Design a protein around this ligand. Sequence first.
Ligand code: 6WM
Lengths: 233, 234, 9, 10
Amino acid sequence: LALSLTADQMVSALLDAEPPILYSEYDPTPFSEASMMGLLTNLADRELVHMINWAKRVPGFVDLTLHDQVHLLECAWLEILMIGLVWRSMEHPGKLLFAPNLLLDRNQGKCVEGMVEIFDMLLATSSRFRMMNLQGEEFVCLKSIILLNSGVYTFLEEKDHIHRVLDKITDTLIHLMAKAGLTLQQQHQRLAQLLLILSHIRHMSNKGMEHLYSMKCKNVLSDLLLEMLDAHR
Amino acid sequence: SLALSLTADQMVSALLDAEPPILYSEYTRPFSEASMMGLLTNLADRELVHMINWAKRVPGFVDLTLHDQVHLLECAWLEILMIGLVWRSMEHPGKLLFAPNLLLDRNQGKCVEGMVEIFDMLLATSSRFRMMNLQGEEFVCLKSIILLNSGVYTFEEKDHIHRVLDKITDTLIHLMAKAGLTLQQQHQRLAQLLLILSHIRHMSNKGMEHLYSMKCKNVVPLSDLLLEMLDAHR
Amino acid sequence: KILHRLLQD
Amino acid sequence: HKILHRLLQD
Ligand SMILES: C[C@]12CC[C@@H]3c4ccc(O)cc4CC[C@H]3[C@@H]1C[C@H](Cc1ccccc1)[C@@H]2O
C-alpha cells in the first residue's frame, strides 16, 4: 500500500493528513502556574485526538497491527506535539506559539519550574528550523519519521515494513532537496542535519515526560493524557 | 580549523587512531546487586578518563573553547559509553560486553531493578547494528557525531560544530560509496544510522534517571568525576 | 485503554 | 571547579 507512493504523492498525502491548529482557553483578561499549565495540558489533550487520526493517515501506519500502532503512539506522542509546536513557532523568534491565542516567551514559561529549561530547548529547535528555513514538505516528513522510528526498536517482518516505509520517506526528503536545487553533497548534509534534530526532540520529550509525571503526583490532568504517561512509566 | 581541511580518508584514519582502548573489569563470584553496580560504575569511571582524551583527538574538538568542550562531554558522555558498549557487543548476540571479562545477558540485569529495561534496549541497538552490518569506520563517525551534536542546541561556535558535523556526514557517504552502495542506498543507510542516535539518546536519558535514583539510595559511592558528569544533567 | 479505542473506529 | 576541566587541559 504505502510502498506504492510517488515521491510527490507521498508529500501531498502527508500534507492532506495535517491536523488543525487548535485554540486554547487562554483569557488575556495574568495566569498562575496551575492555570497556565492547565491551558497547556488541556490543549495537548485535544491535540492528541487529532494526532491519533492523523497517524492513521500516515502511509504504512494502517498496515500495522493495532498492538504496534498503540506502541508507536505511546512512545512518540510528546515528540510529535513538540515538533509541531516548534514548527508553527518558526516565524515567532523567542516565542512559542502553543495556539494562535497563546504565544509565550521564556519569561512566562518561568511560571512553572524546570519549564524554563524545556522552553529554551524548544526555542532553540525553532530557531534552528528558521536558520535552516525548514519547508513544510520537509516538516511533514520528519513528523511521520518520528511516529514510525521512535518506537521501532522497542517493539519480525513488521519491523522491515516500518523500515521500508522509513526508507521511502528518506527518498522523499532527498527528492524534495534535489528539487530545491541542492547539490548531491548538499542533499546528504541537509538530510543529516534534519535527522540529528530528532535526537534533540527525543531529549526534550524525555525531559518533558519527567516534568509531566512529576505533576501527576504533584496533583494540580486528563484521562487520555494520564494514560499516555503510564506507558512511559 | 584544521578539521575542515581533511579528506574523507584522513578523517576516518584520524578517528580510528583516536579510538580508546577496551578496558577490563576489576574481576569474580556470582553477582549481588551492590557488587554488579560497583563493577559497572568502576568501569564507567575509568572509561571516562579515556573518553576525555579521545574527545580531544576528535578533529575540531580542540578548536572549541574549554567551556563548550565541558558542555558537550557533560551532555553526551553516557551516550558515548553506550554506543561503544553496543558496538563491542555486536558479535555477542543476546549479551552485553561491558568488558572482555564481563559479558552479561539480560537475565543478569535482574540483579538490579530497572536495569533489565535498559539492558533490552541496549541489546536491541546491538542487534540493529549487527543487522545493518555496521562497520568500524561508520561507528567512529557516529560516536563523534554524538559528541558534537548532543549538546549543540543548548549553548559562531555552533557554526564550526555544524561545519564539522557536515564534514563527518561527507565522510559517512564517502565510506558508503567506497563500499559500492548506489546513491539511493547511500542516503537510505545514512538515514538509518542517524535515526539510531535518537534511540541512543533515549537510552541515555533513562540511564541518567536510573543512575541518579540508585545514587540517592546510597549502595555504592560514586566517583566524584562520575558524580559531576551526573549532576550536570540536573 | 483509551488510545486503543480511539484507534479502533 | 570541575574535575572535567582539569582532565581536558591535561
Ligand atoms: C548499566 C547502566 C547503563 C550502561 C552504562 C555503561 C555503558 C557503557 C560502558 O562501557 C560502561 C557502563 C557502565 C555504567 C552503565 C550504567 C550504570 C547504570 C546502572 C546503575 C549502576 C549502579 C548504580 C545505579 C545505576 C545504567 O543502567
